[PDB]
Design a protein around this nucleic acid. Structure first.
Lengths: 255, 255
DNA sequence: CTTGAATG
DNA sequence: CATTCAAG
DNA sequence: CTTGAATG
DNA sequence: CATTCAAG
């Protein structure tokens, strides 16, 4: 019963995360960049109704806030089944083009897995839920990611923007990976024998025995919850001799 | 009056040529080659009437002869103005594919011209008329180039073939260039100071003075006529300080 | 919807 | 160069 | 006319 | 992948 021993560490019982040790992120623009305001293609009522609940939840969570900004990018209505179940997808390409590039430090999965000794079996896989949203954005950088929002009848101001690292931003994966590495540096030091692989929001903890793995997992969960991150109890693979990680099936003294 | 001093050397007064010193050519086939008989696409009466006179002239000249052969390639009706003035064009690609390749020994014009000293001005340019037709084809290789010929009402046998090196054959340029080089080897030796450039049927004779050029030209014309080749009196550029050769304008101590 | 690389 | 694909 | 490389 | 080009 891990879900009961670590309420704060699971997305299902700890609530939306927030990396309390990480200073709000400032996003540097290229030297010649100037704000770009792209028109919002009219959205059908169907798409708008499908997206609305997600927008309201984000507003309730403080992840989205009203704003007036010289920047504006289009929101897209993306479905999955056939025409049901929507979710907001922002096209941040014009913003991405104006943000200064950073070095891509996230290792490719092939290389990351090479750091797994055959001696370390007993794997634990955790995926952090709404990872990017756990990282706050400095108020000065928030206007950059604004988009327009119109509600059927009674509609909010006009524009809304993110107060957390957003989806669709070219540097989110890298900034998150680096931030979590900083937050988990001490854990690595306090658990010299454990193996910890990080691929943005996908974590793999490897141990020598089932005991060390259960001990390590308890410690990692406690630490993650403490720092403000949240793992998915639903998808969590705890102390298994076999697990799925980054598209691979780790089994028998390997990976 | 050169046309009068060398009747045998000009196509206009010497009649169709024939390289009397050259043994009839044998065309080696690739090791696995087997005869190919390609159907003749029906020819309109207009095309047939346009081509007929050329075919008759060639038959009268013995350049084309009747035959029965396992090989057959298509004849094409090619016009120039808009729909007038035709001339036979044979598609020998399937034959070319079955003939053993030979090394391309004809130099590119750029390289050939580098063999012209600034000391040798006074140029003479001659182009040999119906050059390929001057080289006989060994009877054993003649069937290879057959094609079908049907005359409006009274039509000859069925197939006709060439008794001379034909147009459209991949190795004609090279075989002709090499043959003329053999026939003109002695002339080069008897005229140590003259410069002679050969590009298949396009010849450039260069001399130091106007006198040597006129002497040389007289000698080259005599030799060519004697060997059975024929130059074009119409296009002949004799002892000029400036001439057109291979797309270039040779002028002032150069080329 | 808009984009830009990848295919036909 | 009209389409398809993959993405934000 | 039929082909095969080069462009769109 | 439909067209254009260049050729035999």
């Amino acid at each position: 019963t891990w879900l009961s021993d670590f309420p704060q560490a699971w997305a299902e019982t700890g609530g939306m995360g927030l990396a309390v040790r990480q200073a709000p992120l400032i996003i540097p623009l290229k030297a010649t960049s100037t704000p770009v305001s792209i028109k919002q293609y009219p959205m059908s009522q169907e798409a708008r109704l499908g997206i609305k609940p997600h927008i309201q939840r984000l507003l309730d969570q403080g992840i989205l806030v009203p704003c007036q900004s010289p920047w504006n990018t289009p929101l897209l209505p993306v479905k999955k089944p056939g025409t049901n179940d929507y979710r907001p997808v922002q096209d941040l390409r014009e913003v991405n083009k104006r943000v200064e590039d950073i070095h891509p430090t996230v290792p490719n999965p092939y290389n990351l897995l090479s750091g797994l000794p055959p001696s370390h079996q007993w794997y634990t896989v955790l995926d952090l839920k709404d990872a990017f949203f756990c990282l706050r954005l400095h108020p000065t950088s928030q206007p950059l990611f604004a988009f327009e929002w119109r509600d059927p009848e009674m509609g909010i101001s006009g524009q809304l923007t993110w107060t957390r690292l957003p989806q669709g931003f070219k540097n989110s994966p890298t900034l998150f990976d680096e931030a979590l590495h900083r937050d988990l540096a001490d854990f690595r030091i306090q658990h010299p024998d454990l193996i910890l692989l990080q691929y943005v929001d996908d974590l793999l903890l490897a141990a020598t025995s089932e005991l060390d793995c259960q001990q390590g997992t308890r410690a990692l969960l406690q630490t993650l919850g403490n720092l403000g991150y949240r793992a998915s109890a639903k998808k969590a693979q705890i102390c298994q001799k076999q697990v799925k990680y980054l598209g691979y099936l780790l089994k028998e003294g390997q990976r």
